[PDB]
Structures are given as C-alpha cells and as structure tokens.
C-alpha cells in the first residue's frame, strides 16, 4: 500500500564520505520543517517526503498564495488567500509539490545547488496514477490522457483548466497559446487555400506564362550553365512558369497584407486571452526581487572578488556571441553552395542519363536540412555553454539570455538557406559576355530556368513538409523511445515507476520550435501561399503529440507559476515586425510583379500585356563569349543559334553601347523600390492601427475585477 | 482681518426664482458636510467656505491620501495614508482645496453640472498671498514668483517641488516636462550650431556651387515664369545655392541620424524621469472606474433612451471629422497657393521697379501664417463643438477625444504648407515643351531658381521666429492683458482680488504649442540644422512665460493630481515615428544630396565631382515653345538664346527621341528610394535598439521602493 507523498530524491546506494555527510546533513537541516523516509530496492533507492498541514499553511501564507472560497458572485467564485479551509485536505497535488519543491529551494545546506554538484540526482514530484489501466479510479492524468492527449479528440478543445491544475501554469499557458495558435491559423488556412486556387483558376488564361511556352515561335534562350551546355527553348521550360503563376498573382499581394494584418490580429488576441487566463487562474505579478536564490558559481565568484579586493566581459561575451552570429550566417551559407554543388559534373563521370532537373536540387536541399539539422544541435550545445560563461547572476536571467541567444542561432541557421535563395540567387550574376569568377576558378552562382522563385517555393515546400511536418515529430517521437530502449537494454510502486521515465528538460524547446514555425509563416508568406494550412497541420498533430509527451513520457514537472509568457512575445513582435520588410522584399525582388506591372503601365502599346516575355528578355550576339567558355557542344536544334536571350534588361548588341543597363532596369528597379517604400510604411501603420484598435484589457475582465475586488472590500468590512 | 478658506463660489446678486431656490438648495445640501458663510460688496458677491477637521481626514481616508510621516529611512521620509498628525493644520492649501473641492463634486443637486448651467459663475480656490508687494511675510507664491517666475532666473534650475505643492501634480508635471525638454535641447542645439558651423567652413570649398556661380562661361537657364519672363544666367543665382550648401551637406545626413537618435533618447529620458517624479510624490494610479461623475447631457440622453426603449454615432462623427481633416488639408494647400499668389502680375499695374525676389515670398508666406493664425482659432472652437456634439460618458474622454481632434486640426494646418514647399513643389511641372495647366488658364506651380530648398528654409526660418519665438509670445502676453484693458475700462480682500484674475482654461493650449514646436524640430530637422537653437530660445523663454501666467495672472487651478502626461506622450511617440520617415523623404527628395552622390559614384570620370551641374542641366531647342508661351521679351543680354537649359535629367534635343526621360532620372530615382529604404529601416532598428537598451524604470528608484515596502511591513508590524 501507498500513502500520499508531495517531492521525492534519489541517494546513490552504496569524498564520498563528506558526500555522505552533505547527504544526511541536508534531510536534517530540513527535518525540523517538514517529514521524510526512506524507500528500499537493491539497486535503485530514493528518499520519500511528505508535508504536514502544521507547516504547509505557514509557509503558504509566507507567499500570496490565492486560494479558493465558498462564496460567490454570480456563478464565479472568488479567490481569497487565507481564511477558512474545513476540509484539511483541499490542496491539490500541484500545489503541495510546488510548496514543498519553495520550501527545499529556501533551504540551501538551495535543492538544486547540491543537486547540481550530484550528490543527489533526482528532484521530481509524483504522478498521479495510470494512463488508462486496469481498475484505475479515474484521477487527473487519467482523465487528461483521455479527454486531451489522445489522438482522436483532435478536432476538440483542450481542457485548459484541467491541464492548468494538473501541470502547471506556465505548461497551462504554453498549451494555451498553441490552441490560441492552431484557432488564428484556421482563417489565415483558408484564405491561403482561396488565394491557391484563385491562381489555379487563373493561370490558364493569364497572359506571360502560355506565352512563355507558346509554341511556333522557336525562340531560345542562352545557357546559365558553367562551360559544357546547351541553348534551350524558353517554351521547353513552361511547367515551371506555370507553376509559379499560382505562387505570384495580383492575389498574392492580398495575402501579405492580410498575413501582416493576422500577424498584428493575433498578437492583439493572444495578448486579451494571456490576460483573461491571468485573471481566471492566480493574479498578482508581484514576484521576489531577485532575492531568492542566487547561483553557486555567482556566489563564489563574489567570494572571489570579496577576497582579491568581469562588469563588461557580458559585453565581451556579447561581441564573441554575435561574431558566432555572423561566423553561423556565413556557415549557413556556404553549406548551402556545398549542398547545391553536391552534384558537380554529375554527367561526365556517373553518366546518370536521366537528366530530370528537378531532383538535383532536391537532393540539394535535403543534404542542406541534414547539415543545418546537425548544426542546430551544436548550436544549442554552444549556446548552452555560452550562456553558462556568461554568468548570470539569477537564473531566471540565464534562461533569458539562453533562450535569447539560442532563438539568434536557430533563426540564423534555419533561415539563411531561404534568404540566399529568394535574395541573392541571381543578382550578382553578370551578363553573358562576362560573369564573376571565385579565385578565378569557376562561375559563382546561377539562377534557375523560369524563375529561382520556384527554388524558393520548392525550398519552403519540403522544409515545412520534410522538417516540421515529418522529420520534427518523428525524432520527438524516436528520441524519447530510443533512450527508453537504451536503458531498456542497458506492481512496483508509484515513486520508481515514475523514476523510470525522463526528467523534464524544459518548455524552451516546444517554444522556439513553434517560433520558428511562426517565422516560416509569417516571414515568407508573398510569394509561398498555404504555409498556414502546413502550419495548421504540423499544429493539429503537435498539440496531441505534446500532450503525449508530458502526460506519458515526461515525469512530472514541478508546476511553477508565470504570468508572463515570457522573452517569446517579444520574439513574437520582432518576426513581426521582421515579416513586413522581408513581404516587402520578397514581392519586389522576387516575385516578378513589379515588372509585370511596369510594363503593363509604362510598355504597353496595345491596353493590356502582351509580349511581356519579349520585352523582358534581351539578345546577345554568341560570338562574344570570352577564352572558350562558349556552349561545349552547340547542337543546333534550331537552324543555327545566332543570338541568345537572356532576360537582365540590358541593351541589344546592334546598338552603340552593346550590353549595357537599359533604361528598362532603372526604371524596373526604382519602381521596385518604390513598391517596398508604399507596402512596408502602409501595412506598418495598418499593423499599428489594427493594434490601437483592439484594447490590450478585455473589457469583460475589466468589470469582472471591478466586481470582484467590490465585493471584496464588502465582505472585509463585514 | 481675513481667516483662512480653501474654496469659493459666485451667486449673482439682485425661472431666476427657482435659480435661487437652487442656489441656496445646494448649499443646505451640502451644510451637513462642510461650513460656508457669505461675503459683501455692492456690485459683486461671494460665498465662502471653509473645510473643518471633523470632515477633512474622513474624505481624505476617504480615498488612498498618502501622506508625510516622522520617520525617515537614510533622510528620505516615508509616506503612510494616515495614522497620526500632532499639528492639525500640516494639510496645505493645495490638499485643502482639492479635498473640498472633492466634497463639491461628490454633491450632485455635481458642482460643475449647475456651475455650466449658469445658476453660478465661479468655483475656484484661494491665492497665498501677493507676489513681491508691501510687508508680505514670504508665503509659497511670493517665493515661487521670486524664485521661479522672474526671467532674472531663466538660467537656473525651476523648483520642481515647490511648483507641485502649490499648484498640483498637473502643472509640476508639465513644468517638469518643459525642464526635461530644454535640458534635452541644449546637446541637439550645440550639435546642430556646429554642423552649420562645418557648413560654413567647407561653402568657399565645396565643388558644385562655386562652379554654379563660376563666372566667364557664359551659360544661361529657361525662364520659370509664366509668360512674361527671361533668360537668366545660372552663376546671377548663386546666393541661393551659396546658402543651400549651408543647409545640406555630408554634415546634415548625420544631424537627421543624430536627431532621431535624440528624439528616441528624449523619449526615453522622460519616461525615467516621470517614473523617477511619481515615485517622488504621490505613487499609486489607482483612480476610480468610471465612477466620479457622469455627464448631464448624457444623463439625460440615458433618460431619453430609457423612455423611449447612438452607438455608432460616434463613428460616424468621427468620419465627419476625418472629412473635416482633408478639408483643412485642401484648405491649407489652397490658401498657401492662394499666399504664393498674392503678387500675380506684380511688375505691370504696381510698377514696383525694385525687384528683389527674395520680398515677395517674404510677403507670400506672411500671408499665409496669418490666415492658419485664424485657422487654428476657428478649428480650436470647431474641435470643441465636435468633441460636445460626439457625447462622451465621463469628462477625461472627452478631453482626450477633444485633444486628438484638435491636435489633428492643428498638425494639418499647420504642416500643409510645408509640407507642399518641401516635397510637391516642382515636381508635377512639366518640361518647356509642355507644362500642366489647371482649368487650361494658368501654369499651375513652378519651383525655385536655385533650388526651393531654400523656400523650405526661409520658411521654416521664419515660422520659427516670426510665429513661435515672436508672435505666439506676443499674443500669450496681450491677450490676458487686453482682455483685463477690456474689463478695465468696462485694501480689497483676497476673494475678491482672486475674482479679478483671469479663471484657467486648461494645459492642452500649453502642451500644443510645445508639441507643434516639437513636430517643427524633429520633423524638419535634415534640410534644416539648428533648429534645437530656435527651440531653445523660445523654450528658455516659454518656460518663465508660463510661470508668470501662472503665478501673476491666472487664478490658482483646482490642483488635480495625475500619473500620466496624458495622450501627449502618445502624441510625442507618433511624431517620432513620423519623424524618420519624413527625414528620409526631405534627404532623398529636396535635399539635392542623393543625386550629388550618384554623379559622384556613376558618372565621374575623373575622380572627385566636377560638372555636376553640366551633368544635372538639360538643354531645350528654344523654337519649341507652343502657342506663344515664350518669353515675352527675349531680351538677348548674351549674344542670342539658342538652347535654354533646365534641370529635368531629360534627353537634349539632338537625339532621336528629344524630351525624352533619360536613364538618368530614373538612375537617381532609384537610389533616391534606395536611400529612403536603408535610411528609414537602419534609424528605426537604431530608435528601437536605444529604446531597448535604456531602462523605462530607473534603477535607483526600484531600489528605492525596494527598501521603502521592505521598511513599511518592518514597521506595521511592529
Ligand atoms: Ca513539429
Ligand atoms: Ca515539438
Ligand atoms: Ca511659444
Ligand atoms: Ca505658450
């Protein structure tokens, strides 16, 4: 039989003599505060704890802890903090541990400091019975795993309130702001779905694409190869064209504004709804000021400085993290080059003779998600230990700056691949009668055939459907299972039950990977529609899978309480106020908009557009290309290639200045920017609009607080 | 002998009978409360009042009164609510007043509801004394206008305290403000004085201007004149490019860079220092809900729609008012056009024969100042009718909803005619061949010889110094003196003296005034430097103007105590966010600087700038002007007008198309909104970072309420 414990430990069962000492010095130094025993098997033991209502009241009156009465007002009853209980056993489980994990932290001998120092290894509270057994008697985990952790509830609400009680209000409101999450995804979905198929619908009847493979007009283009390739059909290369007429259309732009305008939107509701819950659940925010525990490494170092008598090596640190910020920033991009040149002169030795063209680039950027997979890895390691020689003098502040520096890290190497190729894929490209050479050794980058905007699209295509969607969950999934399976090949009671499971490692890592997600959203939503419905299934799987997570791998945590979400809204506001610049730029130099819309307004000649293509594409007379590096085989498929069409707005070689900046790139380019200048400053002060609209303060927990605090004050005085 | 009272009121001395019913049915209702008695003179009466014991610390615990203790921690004395006085009369005037003026208002019959009715006609305190007369026994206003008000001590610091706790938290709070701003404005007023001292160093070195009035080569321009006009050289008009070196240069991007940098960094300094100031004095916000007082017109209109059982109608004013804004825009623009045309054909009839071309746009925009001086009265009084006829529910909104429709009045009329000299002044002309003709009568506008640039600084010169540093003073001096000449012509106690002062209408005017002339610093900054100077002149006057109204001529105000500045801080954030912006805008489009660096950077051809003007001017075939629009007295003070040049970046006339626009004008368009763009987004992030870096809560003052809690429950316990 099994009474009911609150916090449990772990001795190692048998210097390590004065360890020994430490470890019956430190239960003594708490025995005159609270009770524990002793448990028993051969080669695992642990220490028992239990709390007694002599002492539980004491220290939680010791805080404003705020407690539930028996009066009410209006079916909603108040909260008071100490005055009454009649039942000496209304405390719930949740804040006995959190009592007795406050009281363990007060004493110092300061829990985790020799739980650091490993003279212990565990510190965990208890579960509360079975994931759906045999005879179990319907408690809090089994009722959660039922109605919220299971697979098929969900298409249902989250019982927020239970996983409240039963967890946490920090993993509470975590899970909160994923159901706020997935419910402001659903609309933003749906326009997606309705921008996508407004393109389907119009791209067999819009103008530049069924032009671009128009057929019986023979033209060619010019080899955006190195040395050993041929001229090719512009209209051989229409799949790709017509493809993107889906991702660029006058509806895409709408999708941006109202994708900026959802960004805004949700952050509004999430910040009402992150104040409606804070008044539901406990209140107040007055927490210690930094007066609880300080960390043993700070404390020694002040003993050092105490006994030799450092303020700015945070700054240096800071220098040495942002030179690592750009040192991953340029990592990122070369592992991009070395993963699109994974196949180089894949015709000469292999002879593949398959010659698809579109896998290539797959295999391209699968290679590249491998290499940024592992480098996320590491860099969450450094980031670690960064934060750690960092010294912070809290360590509320140390998981601040960690996460700080490890969401810096983890952005700049999950999106440098993305900006490399919706920038600056073909910009610094010349023309063909000179290109730039590395070392002089090779050409240095090229763009794609019909538009490395298709790059881009296939690029956020499979890293929201091979890295989010898939191979996140499965390693979330494999992960807890394969180091079960380690310690598998390498009835019994609640307490040892529970230590066969994995500690809690924090909630960090479900917030930056939804962050991240939260950036593949909103940050590159122009040109890629329905990346809200990738989002919305990747969050329709990974709210039940995270629930999972806690209520059947993870032992329990040790439900500390947070008003705040945390430095995550601010990280929230940054990519917000990211996602509008990086639309801007995205539409003008990438979307191949702006142009249209320069020639059907400047060019025009007819009314509408026609011969778009024409325009864009200038000549080349073949004869100019330099010391050999020609076509190493012209096949003439044609007649006879005479001139090569290459599309950089430059002027024909029949002319005075031959392949010169026309004035067509000019005008081009100041009308691209003048599109960023009107979008970004438009849809900043509709953001800040849409904000200055919606109230902060619900105006319903408004007069709730109105009431309530009333009636408080009428039933003090009385 | 005169004892000591805190309020007053005025009956008027002999329907009119139930007037008087209500006129002594309200003191009766307040008689249970308070004490008053009544005063004597033949022409004029009163009612006094005085506040007594019994009642003054029951309404003052009435609501959270936090006042002075006898203890101290380390010299800065504490401050409970109350527990214990020993001295019976330590309550100042100021509290005095303000707690029965908060008995007046609790009373209903409400003491403005039949003080607006008319039934009475004053409700203000008392005055403490004479300023600087005959044996005066150095009461808080004698010192305060010897110490405070004089302009003998417009170099010395204000006494902040002293101002607060004779006049309220308000008036300290706006005094404060005023200091803060000046003590910011000194650095930016040194700063800009040596970036026009740098301008004045390199203008008899610089490139384009001592070649735009290079003499012996001879090169004419193309009349921008209507009809009746003449060739000009370009070196006869080189005072002005002379002069607008001194007002752009290399040195003025920086200013623009380091003024927002100081408008951010003011913001911030301010938000510490108000934090700093309501630690200081009284802390806690805590106000009521909307609970004080309700308005009689919304009263009634609840009794109305009671008998009768709106919503949306304040939207729909508020469209009315949005309407009523672009009308005042098109007005403003009209009635600078309207100023600029206030010598139309100037040389015929007049026959003026002097001819100076700097006196005419003098004139013009004198005009103008003085026709948005009637403006901003008649859209003072039509924002107040707008903010009555909106409805309001309390008397805080309706102050708010009248300080953003007039501020929004003010900014519009005030900002239009700059706004039109500095960015639409020659944009929309034509070319020689063809201008734009409104109502096909008259050219529609044409812009400087020499750049309008220098209209934009004359303007801004001498909206500077001849409305804000001059008039505005001028009129804030007379109109309370002619308004007491008007009383005038159509030994005394203290009630009666007070009664022949002038009653105070309200801080908004105060902070208007401050914040226009905040607008005209930071928004106008990168064309014009030292404008910190003018505002430091006029601040280092207003500051002691404001005190003499104050403590000489106003009536001493109801010492309302507040938090907040109010929406004004709100107002100064959205200036600063329309300050970079607009800096950018006069950096790229007026300010001749971008086209400069893209001359310098493209066109070169021999190191260093020179011929920038060679390169800027085009050139017109004079046989090309139509209908007889040329100049009606070619008057060949040079050999013979062959070609006229005009700067418009446009094809000379000996190409295939002549008139043309060049690769060149749309070359320095794009590196115009190039620069916009870098320039915008760099000094946002840069505003955002001094924002981040800087604490809102200062340092200091947590730790001071640190230890002051920390000693409170150390004392209440005990
Ligand atoms: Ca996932
Ligand atoms: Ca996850
Ligand atoms: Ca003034
Ligand atoms: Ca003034």
Redesign the interface.
């Given at each position: 039989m099994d009474y009911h414990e609150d916090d449990k430990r772990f001795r190692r069962e048998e210097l390590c003599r004065e360890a020994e000492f430490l470890k019956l010095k430190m239960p003594t130094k708490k025995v005159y505060h609270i009770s524990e025993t002793r448990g028993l098997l051969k080669t695992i033991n642990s220490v028992l704890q239990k709390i007694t209502d002599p002492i539980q009241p004491k220290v939680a009156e010791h805080r404003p802890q705020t407690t539930k009465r028996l009066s009410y007002p209006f079916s909603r009853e108040k909260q008071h903090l100490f005055d009454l209980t009649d039942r000496d056993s209304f405390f719930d489980s949740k804040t006995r541990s959190t009592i007795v994990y406050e009281i363990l932290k007060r004493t110092t001998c300061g829990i985790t400091s020799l739980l650091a120092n490993g003279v212990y290894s565990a510190a965990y509270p208890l579960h509360d019975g079975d994931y759906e057994g045999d005879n179990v008697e319907f408690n809090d985990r089994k009722l959660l795993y039922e109605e919220w952790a299971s697979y098929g509830v969900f298409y249902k609400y989250q019982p927020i309130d239970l996983v409240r009680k039963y967890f946490g209000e920090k993993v509470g409101l975590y899970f909160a702001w994923l159901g706020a999450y997935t419910q402001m995804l659903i609309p933003a979905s749906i326009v997606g779905v309705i921008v996508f198929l407004y393109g389907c619908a119009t791209v067999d009847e819009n103008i530049p694409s069924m032009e671009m493979c128009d057929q019986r007009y023979n033209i060619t283009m010019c080899p955006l190869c190195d040395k050993t390739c041929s001229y090719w059909k512009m209209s051989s290369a229409c799949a790709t064209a017509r493809a993107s007429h889906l991702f660029d259309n006058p509806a895409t732009v709408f999708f941006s504004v109202f994708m900026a305008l959802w960004a805004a939107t949700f952050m509004e509701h999430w910040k009402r709804k992150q104040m409606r819950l804070n008044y539901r659940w406990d209140l107040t925010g007055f927490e210690e000021?930094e007066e609880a525990v300080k960390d043993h490494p700070r404390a020694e170092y002040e003993a050092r400085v105490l006994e030799k008598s450092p303020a700015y090596f945070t700054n240096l640190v800071s220098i040495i993290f942002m030179i690592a910020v750009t040192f991953a920033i340029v990592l990122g991009v070369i592992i991009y080059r070395i993963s699109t040149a994974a196949a180089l002169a894949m015709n000469s030795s292999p002879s593949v003779r398959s010659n698809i063209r579109v896998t290539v680039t797959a295999t391209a950027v699968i290679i590249n998600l491998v290499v940024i997979i592992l480098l996320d890895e590491v860099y969450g390691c450094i980031a670690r230990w960064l934060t750690k020689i960092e010294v912070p003098k809290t360590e509320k502040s140390f998981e601040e700056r960690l996460t700080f520096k490890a969401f810096l890290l983890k952005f700049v190497n999950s999106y440098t691949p993305i900006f490399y190729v919706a920038f600056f894929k073909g910009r610094f490209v010349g023309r063909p009668g000179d290109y730039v050479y590395i070392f002089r050794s090779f050409r240095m980058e090229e763009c794609a055939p019909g538009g490395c905007l298709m790059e881009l699209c296939i690029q956020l295509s499979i890293i929201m459907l091979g890295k989010q969607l898939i191979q996140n969950n499965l390693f979330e999934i494999g992960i807890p299972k394969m180091k079960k399976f380690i310690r598998y090949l390498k009835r019994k009671q609640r307490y040892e039950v529970d230590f066969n499971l994995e500690p809690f490692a924090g909630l960090t890592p479900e917030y930056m990977e939804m962050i991240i997600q939260f950036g593949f959203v909103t940050l590159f939503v122009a040109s890629f529609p329905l990346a809200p419905l990738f989002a919305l299934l990747n969050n329709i799987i990974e709210i039940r899978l995270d629930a999972k997570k806690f209520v059947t791998e993870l032992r329990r945590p040790v439900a500390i309480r947070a008003k705040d979400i945390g430095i995550w809204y601010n990280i929230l506001r940054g990519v917000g106020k990211l996602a509008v610049?990086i639309n801007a730029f995205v539409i003008s130099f990438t979307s191949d908009f702006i142009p249209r819309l320069v020639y059907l307004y400047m060019y025009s000649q007819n009314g509408t557009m026609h011969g778009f293509v024409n325009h864009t594409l200038s000549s080349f007379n073949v004869s100019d290309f330099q010391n050999g590096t020609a076509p190493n085989d012209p096949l003439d498929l044609g007649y006879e290639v005479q001139i090569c069409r290459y599309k950089d707005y430059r002027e024909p070689p029949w002319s005075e200045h031959k392949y010169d900046?026309?004035?067509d790139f000019?005008?081009v380019?100041?009308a691209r920017?003048?599109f960023?200048?009107v979008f970004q400053?438009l849809v900043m002060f509709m953001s800040?609009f849409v904000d200055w609209v919606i109230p902060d303060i619900p105006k319903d927990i408004?007069q709730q607080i109105?009431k309530e605090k009333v009636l408080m004050v009428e039933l003090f005085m009385r």
């Open positions: 000021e610049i900046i026309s004035k000019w005008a380019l100041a920017l003048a960023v200048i400053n800040d408004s109105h």
